[PDB]
Swiss-Prot record, chains A, B:
UniProt-annotated catalytic positions: 25
Domain of life: Viruses
Function: Aspartyl protease that mediates proteolytic cleavages of Gag and Gag-Pol polyproteins during or shortly after the release of the virion from the plasma membrane. Cleavages take place as an ordered, step-wise cascade to yield mature proteins. This process is called maturation. Displays maximal activity during the budding process just prior to particle release from the cell. Also cleaves Nef and Vif, probably concomitantly with viral structural proteins on maturation of virus particles. Hydrolyzes host EIF4GI and PABP1 in order to shut off the capped cellular mRNA translation.
Peptidase A2 domain boundaries: 20-89
Protein name, per record: Protease
Assembly, per entry: Homodimer, whose active site consists of two apposed aspartic acid residues.
Organism: Human immunodeficiency virus type 1 group M subtype B (isolate BH10)
Region of interest: Dimerization of protease: 1-5, 49-55, 88-99
């Protein structure tokens, strides 16, 4: 789908059996989700953004379905204010920026 | 151009007689630039992101040349780590998301 930027580019994701919504973000290297029920192991990590740094849990090899498209990758779970799909998964679904 | 997401989508901008580089950010509603020499009147504002919030000065009606394209709009100047072009100018240059 061709997405215009007049509204926030929100998409529905299915992750770990749960449906959620997330923002398609080109300015984020990573995928960061609001706290949730995930399984398996995890590593602690820190990322930085606009108002500073947050502490997250890094989970590898997580399957995520984005707009009906499967992708497998690292997902960071922590105190983000909004679920963000970043560059690590955006490349997987062949997502491009066109002007 | 058609921009792939394997690397950060960076572009060259021209603002205030100054050459800079900025990120195209679909997850930012606004445009936020590092601290600079900007002529005029401003208003304080608060914006927030991943790690928290920040204090910024809001400049309106600023001309920006974005990768050759001219746009006029609200520009926020403050303590960002990286220069960001968000959705308010992105729509002005016809930029879309595509998968
Ligand atoms: C990984 C990350 O951190 N990468 C940043 C971009 C940048 C941060 C610094 C390091 C380089 C990369 C963003 O790509 C993330 C994006 C974000 O930080 N976006 C802001 C900032 C700019 C702006 N001011 O537009 C945003 O849109 N802020 C709105 C609030 C929207 C939240 N929604 C609710 N109302 N609940 C605001 N008015 O402050 C997400 C979390 C939404």
């Amino acid at each position: 789908p061709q997405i215009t930027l007049w509204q926030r580019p929100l998409v529905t994701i299915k992750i770990g059996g749960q449906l959620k919504e997330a923002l398609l973000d080109t300015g984020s290297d990573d995928t960061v989700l609001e706290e949730m029920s995930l399984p398996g192991r995890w590593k602690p990590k820190m990322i930085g953004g606009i108002g500073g740094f947050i502490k997250v849990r890094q989970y590898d090899q997580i399957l995520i379905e984005i707009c009906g498209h499967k992708a497998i990758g690292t997902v960071l779970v922590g105190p983000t204010p909004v679920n963000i799909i970043g560059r690590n998964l955006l490349t997987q679904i062949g997502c491009t920026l066109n002007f």
